[PDB]
Design a binder for this molecule. Structure first.
Ligand SMILES: [Zn+2]
Ligand SMILES: [Zn+2]
Lengths: 346, 345
């Protein structure tokens, strides 16, 4: 437990298409929890930092560690409940405890938020793609070591999906439409299935994303290019709830035409500012458009769902790459034709 | 007592083409025959005369205008409606068998008939007529002691109450109302009665802001002259925001001013809104709800006006006889001089 300076190799981005694993140094001192990272997933936030060196308007001004969905083992902890060698999933959220949104238990909307691998503030918060990382004790969520290492790495994306399902309101016995079955969309499929949806219909252009959608629990699969949607759009819509995850303006219109009047449409996917929104369709049908952003307490639920085998995300795991060949993994994850979820092994 | 009686109607046939015509109905003792005594000019009637279309619905055949009218019962097939009874005419006639009507969402009725709406073919005739035969369920009685000028606000108040109910819980909340026209002012009075703790309205015209103060608004705001930084700090200030004007800049201010996970009720229609900041709605998780017409709040609006829950007379700008139809529509389209204009029959 003695205060020591441990070494680590961190996945670091410096700019647009500038990426390298560098030497680093953290000085541990009996405050917080020292965690050896074992596995981490590549999200869309990480690809944007490598492809364009930015997310939305947030640019990278100094080198930063990537990754925000990360699991590992405990090495040292200031809490006696967290034993050494314990398998934990790292919650990338570290909010303050005194702002108005965190007081109301809406920690996902914290004013002084510090998310893993987020270039929102400067200096940016370093991510989890590193061999050793010192983290807060409350950010360590234990799980039984018998759980599959490859399954638990889906803790953060599942939390994003579970939170998106709760933004829909009542789901028991409802008819759910899920436009865009990427990694997040497929986890929303299994989320609404577990939460009691009576019929899940999902749509995507690539049949590969549809093939993954049926394996995650979908009942009907539609391709907007080929199949016709007119019987879904009949009598002011058919579905109680719609999930827009692709972020494409074409898919947003269909969700409005497909959702019944006074229905709920959960906006998950982000694709800039939509440039021609049918606001008249929203007013006429009284649709309840609700946004979804990250998660609050659904991270502990996702760790429980994955450990107890409620859902099985392994069909989404496309490939594994050692953390030393990091750029090759970023190039492979950006290819949407072959990679759904790519994990880094530490 | 079958009878044929003549009537005068306020008919539009195209853009700017407006005339008062003579018509003849055939009252065969089914429904209820009423003499319309007073009617209010709404934004739909102006859009039909200013450009011949509401949104994307053009006027193809001549149509009677108006959907905010009151009157007295001439004859009725029900013994409960005594002749001469003052009534407010509900412009909605929903079916009783569709999906949304069974679930008590008749404002979203698949087979809906609304006064003076070009959404259907043939268009449903409006209420701007000296005599009109209507369904008995569309007649809502009110005590004859009530003011005729006050009860004419029944339809726009019913729209405001329905919009306030889209907000969810309003007791002790901080509401922001962007666009404080006639509908916006009635929303000010609605959430005030429903228990809003603080009402802040915003508009460019100082005349409309002066009307909002009399309707119960706590703080008045001109969005260009006043600094709105205080209400945008910490990802927003107000629990609920009411977008009523329809301008994109007003939509943007409501998104920045509403706190995260707040409610934004969209009332004003202003075309397929372009350059919509969807990223702001995602990051803050604002619940954007739409409000369309009304359902059961029409009976509530008639009861509010008959018992003086809210007095809408500060919104009445001018009274015109229905003979000077095109004179009133020209005066109603002038926002500098008019808020709500009434036609008397
Ligand atoms: Zn906070
Ligand atoms: Zn119906």
């Amino acid at each position: 437990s003695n205060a020591m300076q441990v070494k680590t190799q961190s996945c670091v981005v410096a700019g647009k298409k500038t990426v390298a694993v560098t030497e680093q140094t953290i000085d541990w001192n009996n405050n917080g929890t020292l965690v050896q990272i074992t596995r981490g997933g590549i999200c869309g936030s990480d690809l944007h930092y490598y492809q364009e060196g930015k997310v939305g308007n947030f640019m990278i001004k100094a080198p930063m560690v990537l990754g925000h969905e990360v699991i590992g083992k405990v090495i040292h902890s200031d809490s006696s409940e967290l034993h050494e060698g314990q398998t934990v999933a790292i919650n990338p959220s570290k909010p303050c405890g005194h702002c108005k949104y965190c007081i109301e238990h809406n920690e996902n909307q914290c004013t002084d938020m510090r998310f893993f691998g987020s270039a929102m503030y400067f200096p940016h918060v370093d991510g989890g793609f590193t061999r050793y990382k010192m983290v807060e004790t409350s950010q360590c969520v234990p799980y039984p070591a018998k759980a599959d290492e490859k399954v638990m790495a889906f803790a953060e994306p599942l939390a994003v999906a579970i939170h998106a399902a709760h933004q829909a309101g009542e789901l028991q016995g409802k008819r759910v439409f899920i436009s865009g079955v990427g990694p997040i969309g497929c986890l929303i499929v299994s989320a609404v299935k577990t939460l009691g949806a009576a019929e899940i219909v999902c749509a995507d252009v690539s049949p590969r994303s549809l093939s993954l959608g049926k394996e995650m629990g979908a009942d009907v699969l539609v391709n907007p290019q080929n199949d016709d949607m007119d019987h879904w759009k009949a009598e002011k819509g058919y579905f109680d709830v719609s999930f827009e995850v692709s972020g494409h303006p074409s898919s947003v219109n269909t969700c409005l035409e497909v959702t019944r009047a006074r229905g709920v449409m959960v906006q998950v996917g982000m694709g800039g500012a939509m440039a021609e929104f049918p606001m008249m369709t929203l007013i006429g049908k009284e649709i309840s458009l609700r946004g979804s952003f990250r998660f609050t307490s659904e991270f502990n639920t996702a760790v429980s769902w994955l450990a107890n085998g409620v859902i099985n995300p392994l069909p989404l795991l496309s490939a594994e790459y050692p953390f030393t060949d990091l750029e090759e993994a970023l190039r492979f994850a950006g290819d949407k034709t072959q990679a759904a979820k790519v994990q880094l092994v530490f």
